[PDB]
């Protein structure tokens, strides 16, 4: 029971809550009782960016990056419905929460990759025949990644999607075919995949914890350039209440 004054400035506010080391129980799930995730936290620990090789066919492996936006990365306070399917699979549908964080990571060579680390509108199911949540339960699911900048964002030349100029006003007589990629902003909604691997269970309090790995795309600068594929690895915590 730490107060806010015990936490502020230290960096513990960005950490997901941990489960005790001597806790590997099973949380039973009745097929009639409805469940909720009262608190889902996702603390990322590693951002990997897929490199872009010059040749068409190569390894195309993920490389490590440096976080430059400090401890602003965790998703927390996420709530959702945990329903039991007829196959025995448990499906989590999120409703609300702090489910996105803008994150900039720096690749080697100084290049910065902005991304919207999110689980917005996550639907994540388990394999069938899960009557108790154990340390072998996995949640595979998909989420929506909206645009990094929303429609009101203005670029440095005042161009944007829902507001701003539609042309380069500082070149009043330049040809507009070459600048059509920068003049016409586009809103992108891509899809991301996440796997939540349960590692620790508290059958009494209903808390589970473990690791997650998610794949999504980075920011495209409203369609100016191609995005990079980003894999996010970290730990997670979820409080399961009977609704």
């Amino acid at each position: 029971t730490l107060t806010y004054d015990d936490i502020v400035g230290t960096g513990l506010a960005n950490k997901c809550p941990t489960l005790d080391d001597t806790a590997r129980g099973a949380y039973p799930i009745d097929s009639s009782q409805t469940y909720r995730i009262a608190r889902l936290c996702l603390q990322p620990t590693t951002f990997l960016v897929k490199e872009e090789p010059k040749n068409k066919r190569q390894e195309a492996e993920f490389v490590p990056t440096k976080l430059v936006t400090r401890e602003t990365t965790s998703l927390d306070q996420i709530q959702g419905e945990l329903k039991v399917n007829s196959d025995g699979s448990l499906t989590f549908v999120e409703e609300d929460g702090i489910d996105f964080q803008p994150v900039t990571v720096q690749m080697a060579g100084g290049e910065r990759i902005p991304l919207l680390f999110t689980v917005k509108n996550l639907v994540a199911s388990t394999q069938p025949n899960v009557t108790s949540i154990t340390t072998s339960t996995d949640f595979k699911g998909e989420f929506n990644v909206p645009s990094y900048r929303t429609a009101n964002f203005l670029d440095p030349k005042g161009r944007g999607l829902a507001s701003g100029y539609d042309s380069a006003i500082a070149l009043p007589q330049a040809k507009e075919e070459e600048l059509a990629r920068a003049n016409v902003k586009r809103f992108s909604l891509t899809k991301g995949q996440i796997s939540l691997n349960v590692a620790k269970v508290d059958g009494r309090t209903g808390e589970i914890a473990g690791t997650f790995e998610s794949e999504q795309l980075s920011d495209d600068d409203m369609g100016a350039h191609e995005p990079h594929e980003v894999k996010i690895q970290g730990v997670f915590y979820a409080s399961i209440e009977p609704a």
């Binding site: 440096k66 430059v68 936006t69 602003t72 005042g158």
Partner: protein, 333 residues
């Protein structure tokens, strides 16, 4: 004793540049600020000044020239938080959030305060009267107002003046938008100070040059008529006084050289004191005069003045500045 020899060397007036104890603080801080400024101005990566993940590139290698280049102020997410290098997880994070700006401005402000103290110290070691440092307190107060006091009042070092030419112009324009500094009497006193300083500088220079005593021939420069360390005055003070007293009237002219030079010191120094205080008092949001919709006709229609035209220009600046940083109707800071 090694300490006695070190004290003798530090306070020695025979050094080519005087050090003193104020210089013992001043030299490392100003060297650090200068080296970090040169490196940041050439090669710093872009800085997210407004804290909205919109990095602003200010260095020469990232697409700037001398005019547009700047050391960008630290992030708005940092605010007034102290952000040294060791507070950042890496140098990339420190550079992204504008740490070089905080390093440079803190070292510079300390070094410039010690420069003022050093001016006093050397004047004391030479048997001089001590108040040159008082005159230097006016630009130093100005530097403190734009680099420290305005960030403190506004709550973020992002609102400090950028270390660049175009960044300075951005600071001026946004300041007029938010505070109407042109209508502030302290800035008007500052303009009177600098315009009068330039006027009285040109006036004193032309009056002394006009009354130079003939010591040279027509081929050589008149400056060779003065020898360094000579005892006699190189110009006729009475002739300059007679000219300037006939130019306006006798009692608008100084016949006393000491009173004249005190006036030359006092006018721009007091004016710049007032304009630095204007920047600080507007840092606590006590803005310039607001005469918007002051003139009203008999029915109640607004009769515009020049203040309303200034208000239109200020509104244009206000709605365009930091175009993505505001989520709410009032720009409260």
């Amino acid at each position: 004793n090694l300490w006695e020899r070190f004290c003798n060397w530090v306070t020695s007036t025979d050094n080519r540049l005087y050090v003193g104890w104020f210089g013992v603080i001043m030299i490392p801080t100003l060297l650090a600020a200068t080296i970090c400024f040169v490196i940041a101005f050439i090669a710093a990566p872009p800085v997210d000044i407004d804290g909205i993940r919109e990095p602003v590139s200010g260095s020469l290698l990232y697409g700037n020239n001398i005019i547009t280049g700047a050391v960008v102020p630290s992030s708005n997410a940092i605010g007034l938080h102290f952000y040294p290098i060791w507070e950042a997880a890496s140098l990339d994070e420190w550079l992204y959030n504008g740490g070089p700006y905080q390093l440079i401005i803190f070292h510079f402000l300390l070094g410039a305060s010690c420069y003022m103290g050093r001016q006093w110290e050397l004047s004391y070691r030479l048997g001089m009267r001590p108040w040159i440092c008082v005159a230097y307190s006016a630009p130093l107060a100005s530097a403190f107002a734009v680099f420290l006091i305005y960030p403190i009042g506004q709550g973020s070092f992002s609102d400090g003046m950028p270390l660049g030419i175009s960044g300075t112009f951005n600071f001026m324009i946004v300041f007029q938008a938010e505070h109407n500094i042109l209508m502030h009497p302290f800035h008007q006193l500052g303009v009177a100070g600098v315009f009068g300083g330039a006027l009285f500088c040109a006036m004193h220079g032309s009056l002394v040059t006009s009354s130079l005593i003939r010591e040279t021939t027509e081929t050589e420069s008149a400056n060779y008529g003065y020898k360094f360390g000579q005892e006699e005055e190189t110009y006729n003070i009475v002739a300059a006084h007679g000219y300037f007293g006939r130019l306006i009237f006798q009692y608008a002219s100084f016949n006393n050289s000491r009173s004249l030079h005190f006036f030359l010191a006092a006018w721009p120094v007091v004016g710049v004191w007032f304009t630095a205080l204007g920047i600080s008092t507007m840092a606590f949001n006590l803005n310039g005069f607001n005469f918007n919709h002051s003139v009203i006709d008999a029915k109640g229609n607004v009769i515009n003045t020049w203040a309303d035209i200034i208000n239109r220009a200020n509104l244009g600046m206000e709605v365009m500045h930091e175009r993505n940083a505001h989520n709410f109707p009032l720009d409260l800071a």
